[PDB]
Each structure stands twice: as C-alpha cells, then as structure tokens.
Write a protein that binds this ligand. Structure first.
Ligand SMILES: CC(=O)N[C@@H]1[C@@H](O)[C@H](O)[C@@H](CO)O[C@@H]1O
Ligand SMILES: CC(=O)N[C@@H]1[C@@H](O)[C@H](O)[C@@H](CO)O[C@@H]1O
Ligand SMILES: [Ca+2]
Ligand SMILES: [Ca+2]
Ligand SMILES: [Ca+2]
Ligand SMILES: [Ca+2]
Ligand SMILES: [Cl-]
Lengths: 112, 111
C-alpha cells in the first residue's frame, strides 16, 4: 500500500522533490479519492502534490511525466494566474489549486 | 512501523533532522525482526536511533528510553578513539558504536 508522510517545513517544489527522494519516495500523487483523503489526513496545511503542467500548459503529469487521470480541482482551478502556475497543491479542504513551482508549501511524500 | 533508508550518508545530527522532517525518528530495532527489516532497507552501514551520549555505556533511544533488545557485534560497544556515542547497524545486522560526528546512511522509522 502507499504510505503518506507530511513535512514540517515549507519549501519550493524542487526541494520537496529532493526531500522525498532522499528517503526513496516521491511527492504524493493521489490516484483516486481515497488517496486524496489519505493525503488530507496527514497535511495540516496547504501541501504540494507531485503533479505539474510544466511540459505542456494545461496537461498535468505526475513527476515521472505520466499524464494523470484523477483530478480534484478547486472550482475555478486550474487558472494559471500571472506569470504562470505550473505546480499543484492540496488545499485544506482537499481540493487542488495550481500554484507557482517556486512558491513554498508543506510537502507530502509517498512511499510503498 | 515503516522503515525507509536514505541514499546519502550524513552525521547523526543531520540524520535526526531528516527523519524528523517527515515526522519520524531514526530507526530503533526493538527485536530481531525489526533489526532484520532495517538491515534489509539499508544498503550499507546505517545509523540507528540509539546513543549513550547522556550516560556512558547506557544506551537509550532518541527519546530517553533505555533500550532492551541489543545486537552488538562481538567486541562492541567499545567506545574507542576519543569516544563513540552513536550506533550503526553493520551490513551483517550486528551493531557497532561509532563517533556521532561520522557519516553513515540513515534508516528512518515511521508509525
Ligand atoms: C499564489 C497563490 O496561491 N495564488 C492563488 C491562485 O493560485 C488561485 O487560483 C487564486 C484564486 O483562488 O487565489 C490566489 O491568487
Ligand atoms: C570509526 C570506526 O568505525 N571505528 C571502528 C570501531 O567503532 C570498532 O569498534 C572497531 C572494531 O574493530 O573498528 C573500527 O575502529
Ligand atoms: Ca500551468
Ligand atoms: Ca491557481
Ligand atoms: Ca560511548
Ligand atoms: Ca566501536
Ligand atoms: Cl561520539
């Protein structure tokens, strides 16, 4: 099964990736509602998920370049505000928001 | 308990920070079964969450709890050099006390 653990500090996506990879895990990517809720259970605040549309705008992929199927976007999202929001966070209500990859948030790592 | 190993080596202070970052602690085997599980996740010598820093030759976990199960390599713990207050699990599963300032892999433990 997948196990999810939340970080204590906030950091941008690249650091988030490095943290999870240090323990041979990856940034959490919910594949269904059950997993999305499991990630919610561990994230005490807005947290990064391992999904981006960095390759092609509005085409969301997990960190291994695999296009995602399940999505749980907050109403009005993804909106790619300003100079661009190509990373994704899980809001405190479980819904998703696209945000700048350079912004800092807690990170939830996934292991199995 | 879930056990995860780091890929890079680092001293105990940094090992503790890493496990603590994800709300876990440096792995402390409480029996032979956990010892084997940790050995298997670690691909090389790795730190355990046990030290005798507070009191020499009194080994306890990172929360002050004295350890009951031990699996010391023959001749250990020996506190050689200028002192060895940290502990590593060798590639054969036995333990060796080493300087806390030295760098090894780290196996983190989560509940
Ligand atoms: C940096 C950041 O979190 N910006 C968010 C944006 O992503 C979101 O789409 C918008 C509408 O809810 O609110 C904020 O502007
Ligand atoms: C720094 C280090 O790993 N020293 C070890 C010491 O801990 C161990 O007791 C001894 C056993 O032969 O070998 C080495 O000297
Ligand atoms: Ca985008
Ligand atoms: Ca947005
Ligand atoms: Ca000692
Ligand atoms: Ca020794
Ligand atoms: Cl020491």
């Amino acid at each position: 099964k997948k196990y999810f653990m939340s970080s204590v500090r906030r950091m941008p996506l690249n650091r988030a990736k490095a943290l999870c990879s240090e323990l041979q895990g990856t940034v959490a990517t919910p594949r269904n509602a059950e997993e999305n809720r499991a990630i919610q259970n561990v994230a005490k605040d807005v947290a990064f998920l391992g999904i981006t549309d960095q390759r092609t705008e509005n085409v969301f992929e997990d960190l291994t370049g695999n296009r995602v199927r399940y999505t749980n976007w907050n109403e009005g999202e993804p909106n790619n505000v300003g100079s661009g929001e190509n990373c994704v966070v899980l809001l405190t209500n479980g819904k998703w928001n696209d945000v700048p990859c350079s912004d800092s948030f807690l990170v939830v790592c996934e292991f199995s």
